[PDB]
Assembly symmetry: D2
């Protein structure tokens, strides 16, 4: 079972990056979605 | 059929997103690399 | 009305980046979502 | 309550995503900057 030790700090930073990226994309969609469609 | 105008607000928000992505990727990749690399040749 | 000229190539690259980033995040969610929840 | 193990597959896919993000941001930011900057001092 291949697995990787990490501290809570590193896992938190990974989680935060994914969350913030999604939030950013959703923010952009709120501007550009209606242009992609018309 | 080949050229577009983009509104200022949309361009501003895109540039801000890309800048923030970049700052985030750079930090995250550096800390992942340094934490997982536990033995390094001097 | 402040606006910015660009060619189809540049707009396509912007669109592709946003689409590919979303796809990547959705891909990661298909692995990590059940860990975030339990 | 302070340390974790991450499975190999999840780590692999995260690293791949970050690498791909980075390659994409670098390219996109460079072409945006160069296209919008239309006058440059020699
Ligand atoms: Ca719009
Ligand atoms: Ca407009
Ligand atoms: Ca370490
Ligand atoms: Ca999982
Ligand atoms: Ca496991
Ligand atoms: Ca130009």
């Amino acid at each position: 079972e291949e697995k990787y030790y990490m501290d809570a700090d590193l896992l938190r930073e990974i989680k935060q990056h994914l969350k913030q990226q999604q939030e950013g994309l959703s923010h952009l969609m709120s501007i550009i979605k209606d242009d992609l469609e018309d």
